């Protein structure tokens with residue numbers, strides 16, 4: 001969004017008139033540096049290339065999930081969305097680091113839910129139900 | 142140390158040195174070494190036995206002149222080391238080589254040993270942090286503010302046409318001939334000897350160069366002016382005497398447009414340009430004819446642009462828009478481009494760092510020059 | 512449920528894309544990928560190593576041209592992915608591919624793996640909600656508005672006669688040969704070489720293609736025009752030079768009716784049409800002869816209709832009326848047919864849904880297409 005704002009400012013009449021005036025004075029240092037040294041074109045290309053992966057990420061469904069089946073479905077949605085990386089040129093190492101971060105969020109959410117469950121206090125069959133649900137979540141992962 | 146990089150347009154006749162970001166080359170001077178010809182006899186005479194820069198021009202008659210490089214190729218490397226040291230002296234740039242990256246320039250299609258030895262001199266004799274040896278057509282295009290064009294650079298030692306389209310150089314269309322301002326000045330000296338004026342000393346050769354710069358022109362067409370036998374013109378020598386130039390005024394700079402006047406089986410400057418254009422792809426030819434950029438001092442001859450336009454029109458197809466762009470700063474277009482290039486943050490990615498030179502050596506500069 | 516379906520007639524020569532319901536394909540561009548072949552030297556040059564669409568045509572002299580399709584078969588699938596990405600870019604269709612069903616077209620009797628890989632690309636990379644690989648000829652007939660006839664579609668890569676009865680393409684009467692417009696342009700390049708005018712570069716093959724599109728015709732009597740003295744019409748090349756064509760003007764499109772001129776022992780285009788008609792039912796032959804519909808770009812040669820009518824009359828039975836229809840929208844007839852088909856509500860029942868491909872794979876397209 002910030003790069004789109006900068007690009008919209010760059011196309012405004014004031015900037016173009018300034019560059020035209022500097023060109024007419026043969027002050028090509030500033031104009032060439034503005035065209036090339038900004039890095040705005042490369043940054044725009046990179047963020048636009050990354051946008052399909054970042055657009056409408058379902059991570060909120062994982063963060064708002066309060067039940068283990070909801071966490072499992074949110075993980076399904078997150079990985080189905082991560083399958084969109086093929087269309088982009090995202091770094092694969094960066095993708096693995098994103099998967100690390102998603103694992104961190106999954107661990108935090110599971111810890112929160114199990115803290116609300118109070119596993120040791122409840123009877124054994126309920127504990128087994130919660131355990132098989134959690135291990136189904138891990139198998140889904 | 143990442144101070145302002147030092148741009149050195151390393152011309153064969155004139156060296157133009159300055160810091161990157163300056164609008165113009167602040168320190169320009171002729172590219173020769175003068176040595177005292179006569180015998181030192183008095184206490185308190187001129188100090189030093191090597192005169193470079195305006196000190197050599199002030200005492201030109203006292204000195205024997207040697208040019209370190211011919212046709213863009215360095216023949217004497219000790220003299221070139223001395224001149225590049227003088228570029229850093231207290232008179233010129235008042236700085237230390239260790240603290241500034243250097244942007245050097247050389248003619249296209251030059252020998253590889255020249256580039257290797259230049260990098261060796263700039264990394265070993267001078268402990269420069271970073272070096273970048275650049276071709277000159279790109280700098281002409283930077284200085285004139287285009288990305289597309291065919292740069293016809295005619296300097297003191299080398300003439301060459303380089304076509305570039307949208308910032309892409311065509312390395313196989315680059316035309317080069319070794320006929321330039323120094324050859325024209327030698328031919329003018331020969332013609333002046335054929336008038337009756339013998340200029341056989343080296344300072345007298347500098348006087349011949351001044352004659353060429355001052356009183357010489359290119360006729361729009363050679364045949365009618367040759368057959369007319371116009372009157373002679375008076376040129377005042379440095380010592381006060383006068384000389385009658387006559388046909389040497391225009392027959393001398395015609396060497397650019399027909400090198401066969403000295404027996405060279407080479408191409409004219411117009412043929413160099415047209416061959417560079419026509420060796421390009423078929424679709425780029427019309428765009429290249431409309432964007433011709435002149436550079437170098439030898440393109441400053443009176444009536445040069447008109448004759449070149451007529452010749453290119455004779456050689457180009459019918460009804461093709463030929464438009465030759467001839468900026469006022471043709472002499473310093475290459476340096477102004479080098480200054481524009483060296484001021485960019487992208488320039489940090491182009492040079493050869495010192496440690497990178499130690500790792501590879503000549504290979505690093507050979508890869509990163511192109 | 513999804514957005515309006517996107518019709519993509521991907522020919523070997525030019526891709527034609529748009530949204531269903533448009534009168535004409537608004538987004539047509541040549542089906543090749545251009546890559547710069549020269550050395551980028553300066554900052555501010557053209558960005559990107561892949562040039563597709565009008566950006567490839569504007570800088571055509573700068574690029575090596577690669578065709579992904581050959582004879583209706585994708586030979587380079589990375590380039591095909593690039594081109595179909597460009598179809599969805601901000602320059603064409605301005606939309607995301609995850610929202611619009613696709614109606615791709617494929618030439619008859621193509622390899623099965625071609626259709627399978629195309630569906631895999633469209634369902635995995637582009638994540639389309641639905642897909643429907645159609646056939647070009649039946650769409651062209653739908654565009655004409657008729658339900659029964661013969662479509663003789665002659666494109667850049669493949670020419671084929673397909674008879675259709677009440678909207679159903681008879682599959683055992685389809686005739687196809689791989690001699691098409693690109694083969695005619697290669698033959699024209701060979702003949703221009705035999706006339707002294709030599710083109711090598713992939714960018715100059717587009718100049719040859721332009722020469723074919725501009726100055727080439729089909730003579731009604733090849734042997735009569737062969738023996739007579741030629742006129743030698745002159746063609747102006749992009750650089751401004753001229754070339755005298757002469758006998759190559761009409762012998763180049765002769766390849767469509769006589770493949771043996773390049774040593775291929777395959778049927779001619781007239782033979783393709785007549786054998787497609789005569790391979791069908793004896794009851795349908797009269798109405799198939801009375802309903803012939805031309806399509807594709809290669810049917811636009813001057814005098815194509817008269818020549819094909821003469822050949823078909825030579826091969827057809829007597830007392831059979833022959834009516835070759837040559838609609839004005841021959842280039843976009845198949846796309847207009849795809850748009851007409853995709854507008855119908857029945858098209859919802861035709862596509863392979865994304866879930867169907869996910870659960871079945873190539874079998875889903877294999878049953879649904881046929």
Ligand SMILES: Nc1ncnc2c1ncn2[C@@H]1O[C@H](COP(=O)(O)OP(=O)(O)O)[C@@H](O)[C@H]1O
Nearest residue numbers: 152153154155296297322354437438439441442
């Ligand atoms: N006004 C002029 N008319 C003709 N020749 C000139 C003029 N000014 C300079 N020159 C010639 O140009 C040459 C210097 O050109 P320059 O741009 O220094 O080339 P390089 O960079 O290769 O040394 C000198 O040899 C000189 O003779």
Ligand SMILES: Nc1ncnc2c1ncn2[C@@H]1O[C@H](COP(=O)(O)OP(=O)(O)O)[C@@H](O)[C@H]1O
Nearest residue numbers: 522523524525666667692724807808809811812
């Ligand atoms: N006016 C014309 N005359 C002759 N040939 C043409 C003309 N216009 C286009 N073509 C040829 O037709 C081909 C494109 O036909 P098209 O129907 O687009 O094929 P496809 O079915 O592969 O898209 C090109 O190769 C071109 O050479």
Ligand SMILES: [Mg+2]
Nearest residue numbers: 152296437475
């Ligand atoms: Mg120079």
Ligand SMILES: [Mg+2]
Nearest residue numbers: 522647666845
């Ligand atoms: Mg087609």
